[PDB]
Design a protein around this ligand. Structure first.
Ligand SMILES: [Fe+3]
Ligand SMILES: [Fe+3]
Ligand SMILES: [Fe+3]
Ligand SMILES: [Fe+3]
Ligand SMILES: [Fe+3]
Ligand SMILES: [Fe+3]
Ligand SMILES: [Fe+3]
Ligand SMILES: [Fe+3]
Ligand SMILES: [Fe+3]
Ligand SMILES: [Fe+3]
Ligand SMILES: [Fe+3]
Ligand SMILES: [Fe+3]
Lengths: 163, 164, 164, 164, 164, 164
């Protein structure tokens, strides 16, 4: 194995955090479906799948550097939010935490002069920018919407079309 | 409003969480197979893991169709190591037969309450479990015949590595 | 909420305005070249002007992506004459090297603040600058090959007039 | 040798710089719409800005075609903040009617000098201004009817964000 | 003008000559495999040799984009013999790891000089080295499982002989 | 078992290494043309370098076809500087005439030993050398007709730069 044990641990930890992110977004989906917003729930199911592809990227990079993955327990996520906007605020807060988590691996890797891992992490830096922005844009629309059901209906239909 | 009983909703939600754990267990077998250098076996387990997620989502959508709600529970840490190829596939067979029995138990509970809609919904899973168990028994039979011979194991690994 | 610091956001916004000026400087070179008859040199500077606008719009979109705002500033009047071609293209090269250094300064600022998102975003512009600097250095080498001999300098005009 | 009067050249060069300012103004409106989170309004304005650059390039090319030369001037800092969506489009309409009058003044100067070429050339801009004022007047009428209502404003934003 | 330090141009020109030796070493490994009758292993090494040339030429073209010059140095005689298949691929892995550390040293030199253009250029090679090391490690894992068994080795020769 | 004599195998293995040196020499010439800003001439040389590698590999494969083995030798540092474009191409023609004579020497040795397989194999290179020499002579003649006229030189650079 040509990554350090400390960097293998950080990458393995982040893999498990990506799995939890997936599970959290699935849990938000369960909340949206309970509230009858099939389009919002669909957006979250697609988000969950996207998080799984991030975990598998960490998975394959670890083995590529001679390491091994160990899967850990996945914590029980919240299952309820105080309305659609509250759920997206929690999504944003979670994405920012993920970003900082990725930043911490990057700085560790840089400090150990593990350039291969620094470079690998660049894709996740850029992807985090995009994911934060998607949620921020949804939140700004919802702020403008205030309560309006007609606006919320359209947003649900639109996010219901995510590929 | 919910037209499944709370008992049947809990049994269905429990099984959804068991399907999620099944997925995680198979991903963990993949981590084992990748660590041992058998990328084909690992690929097979990653595809199996995706399959168990589709099962979880089938329970999910039926729960909502009947006015219920899903609650995701913590996922237990799976084992991450086995004593060999065969040991891992045998643990998979044992797990699948446990899943089948778990499904049988919901089926008999639904049947006792005369929830015919749920009994009928579970037929898909009864038939799928028959295929799932059989696929692992087949693999175990090929491994029994292979014995140690890496010439055979290489071809099995390549073969399972082609699963779509 | 804005997730770049106000220092980095001003550095990005300043550079956005510098890219707008670069576009205007090159259009002003196109006015010189077009006046002196060298239309091909001019068509090349109009293409370069359009390119610098795409640079500006990249800074623009990133600023909003990070929750900042863009503020457009006054654009200074650019030169409109140079002492012959090689004077102009040498002013271009010197300008692009100033752009490159300006970008480098943003990168080092972001790095010092641990704004890895802005550091990563700026890589594109580092790599582009390498290429912008080089296409000009190239043209300055060709002109110096044509001595002061006019019928070759016109030949270079026709090739730069090919830029897509 | 130049076959437009220096007075007509200056009037055309002035208008060229005015079209550049118009482009920059509409870009500044875009920065406002984007700051306010209306990406479709912002997109309309980015397309308007590109269209004003082509207007400037038509003046650019006619000037050199008649033997004149272009001199680019300083570009003033455009405003950055409007009271609300409707006020921004109202300022766009006011700006376009000012551009039209600016064009009208070139036309009547050219016509007094019997510069029939420049008169005929300006016709395209006269007809284009009629369309661009009309486009903004339509948006303003929709925004008038919407009154404050965010549901309708959102529909207009999506519609205007389709502009090709 | 050359806009890379002479220290950096030396480290890049040196690495280019190292890439050339790499190509030659793999060709020499091909000469070994072909003498042993393993045309598929030989073919893999001939493809590897060509790939190292694309690496050398990438350094080549960057050196000139930064205004530098390439000087080709003498190439040492590579080893022509190995003590079995495993020994040859182990030597290949040790060489790629040396090549990776060589690239790392250039990156740390460039970074200490704030030569961001070169730091960025070298990212491609950091990522490519990860893949190169991994392909060799994978080959060495399959070889370890094969043990000495010709029946498996012939399978591996077949697979590596497919490399495009 | 090797069915060429060791003397012929040595001569064929020496020529293989000479073809490798040819490839390296023509790349060094590329480094000179690129330093002098003639990217088309450099392109022609890089293409020639790859052509020389296909010559080396033809020798490589014939050696093994007759049961011999290839041994790669050290590659001498080539010159990197010429006193102009014509000087470099004169050095190329001189090199190809030396390659031609080296091939003649093998052919005469093989004919002495009544190695008719190898005599026949070398026919291809006799004919190819005639064309490799003619190609450089045509370039030298175009350069002579150019005299020192940078205009025509530029057209020759662009043309040779379209070599496939
Ligand atoms: Fe993620
Ligand atoms: Fe994410
Ligand atoms: Fe299942
Ligand atoms: Fe199953
Ligand atoms: Fe730029
Ligand atoms: Fe630029
Ligand atoms: Fe206009
Ligand atoms: Fe207009
Ligand atoms: Fe390499
Ligand atoms: Fe390599
Ligand atoms: Fe040759
Ligand atoms: Fe030759």
């Amino acid at each position: 194995m040509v990554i350090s044990e400390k960097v293998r641990k950080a990458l393995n930890d982040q893999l498990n955090r990506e799995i939890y992110s997936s599970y959290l977004y699935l849990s938000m989906a369960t909340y949206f479906d309970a509230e009858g917003f099939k389009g919002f729930a669909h957006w979250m199911k697609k988000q969950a799948q996207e998080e799984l592809t991030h975990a598998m990227k960490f998975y394959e990079y670890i083995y590529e550097r001679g390491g091994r993955v160990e899967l850990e327990a996945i914590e029980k996520p919240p299952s309820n939010w105080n309305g659609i906007k509250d759920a997206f605020e929690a999504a944003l807060k979670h994405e920012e935490f993920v970003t900082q988590s990725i930043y911490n691996i990057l700085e560790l890797a840089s400090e150990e002069k593990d350039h291969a891992t620094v470079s690998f992490l660049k894709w996740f830096v850029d992807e985090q920018v995009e994911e934060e922005d998607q949620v921020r844009e949804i939140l700004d629309l919802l702020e403008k919407a205030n309560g309006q059901m007609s606006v919320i209906f359209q947003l649900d239909r639109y996010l219901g079309q995510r590929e």
